[PDB]
């Protein structure tokens, strides 16, 4: 019957799901649980390279709030 075609689609669907899921989870792991910073224009890149210096650990995804001003 036709529903015997579904197992081949489920396997194919699981394979198409992994690339998107893996990139989403790997980005979270590499940016401290946040989205990877998108820098399409120099202003955004300028802010990302300023985040590295402010973090004090050479990482742009380490945020510093009001606890770092006094």
């Amino acid at each position: 019957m036709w529903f015997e075609v579904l197992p081949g689609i489920a396997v194919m669907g699981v394979c198409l799901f992994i690339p998107g899921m893996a990139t989403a989870r790997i980005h979270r792991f590499s940016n401290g649980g946040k989205e990877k910073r998108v820098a399409h224009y120099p202003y955004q890149w300028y802010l990302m390279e300023r985040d590295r210096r402010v973090s004090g650990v050479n990482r742009s995804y380490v945020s510093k709030g009001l606890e770092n001003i006094d």
Binding site: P7, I9, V11, C15, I18, G20, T23
Partner: protein, 318 residues
């Protein structure tokens, strides 16, 4: 963690391609009142695995009249470039986030044509040559129409960034405002992927096997893998362009599930179409896209340049 990301892209792609071959044979089977693979594994789930092993332990031959360096470069180029057209695709986060992703895919799709031209020419065979020159005619047919169809859609998005197409379709799919452009785009992806009814570079019933008539064993598998990785990619592109999916930054998996289903359905439509229609003559494909799609695409291109201006709906640049 970036190398793991690359492998978590190409390896699943090669697995999806492997089981798309199973899915096509079973979907073609049931539309033809039969079953398709159901013996090798439960419901044919091991058929792709049996075919991969068979092809890579079979003898590959270099024809005595072939140009070896180009004969072997062509299959490498085909698969290397079919995997390279996935890196900018947002699902919902691209592996490589490009500001001109739409341009990049256009450029790579034009370079992947030469995996056909050099394959067919290097084989030094008449049927491979006739197949190669049908890829020249096919590219001349759809290239102009394809690029201007993309441009018309991008005039409602405002950028060449693929991830921006997610924001553009946050309220509504672009299939509604651009259904005439979606029709022509869909046909142009059939022509661009050498799929029926535009499977002319191979043209089994005319050229035996066309541009890859002389290829055997693993080298042939690379062309087959490249062919099937492109149709999935060209349908992921279509889902992003015209069937946008909502992106919740806290549930990036919900996007992937919904986006994956639409891509599967569009891919199924490729198989649905291959079972329903005859094959165009390759001179009739040229007249289809130059005398029907190009006049309409040019008109719609003017319409979509003016419509945002006269409605005060020009999209933001960033």
């Amino acid at each position: 963690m970036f190398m793991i990301n690359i492998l978590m892209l190409i390896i699943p792609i090669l697995l999806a391609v492997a089981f798309l071959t199973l899915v096509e044979r079973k979907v073609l089977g049931y539309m033809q009142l039969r079953k398709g693979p159901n013996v090798v594994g439960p419901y044919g789930l091991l058929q792709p695995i049996a075919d991969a092993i068979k092809l890579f332990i079979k003898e590959p031959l270099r024809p005595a009249t072939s140009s070896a360096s180009m004969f072997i470069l062509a299959p490498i180029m085909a698969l290397g470039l079919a995997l390279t057209m996935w890196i900018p695709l947002p699902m919902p986060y691209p592996l490589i986030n490009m500001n001109l992703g739409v341009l990049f895919m256009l450029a790579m799709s034009s370079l992947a044509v030469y995996s056909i031209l050099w394959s067919g020419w290097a084989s030094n065979s008449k049927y491979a040559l006739i197949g190669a020159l049908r890829a020249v005619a096919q590219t001349i047919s759809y290239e102009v129409t394809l690029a201007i169809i993309l441009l018309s859609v991008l005039l409602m998005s405002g950028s060449f960034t693929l991830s921006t197409l997610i924001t553009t379709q946050e309220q509504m799919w672009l299939i509604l405002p651009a259904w005439p452009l979606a029709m022509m785009w869909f046909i142009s992806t059939l022509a661009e992927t050498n799929r029926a009814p535009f499977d002319l570079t191979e043209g089994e019933s005319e050229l035996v096997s066309g541009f890859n008539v002389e290829y055997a064993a693993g080298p042939f598998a690379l062309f087959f893998m490249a062919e099937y990785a492109n149709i999935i990619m060209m349908n992921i592109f279509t889902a992003i362009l015209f069937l946008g999916t909502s992106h919740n930054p806290h549930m990036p998996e919900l996007y992937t599930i919904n986006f994956t289903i639409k891509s599967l359905l569009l891919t199924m439509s490729f198989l649905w179409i291959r079972a329903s229609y005859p094959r165009f003559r390759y001179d009739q494909l040229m007249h289809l896209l130059w005398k029907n799609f190009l006049p309409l695409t040019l008109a719609l291109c003017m319409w979509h340049v003016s419509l945002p201006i006269l409605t005060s709906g020009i999209p933001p640049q960033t």
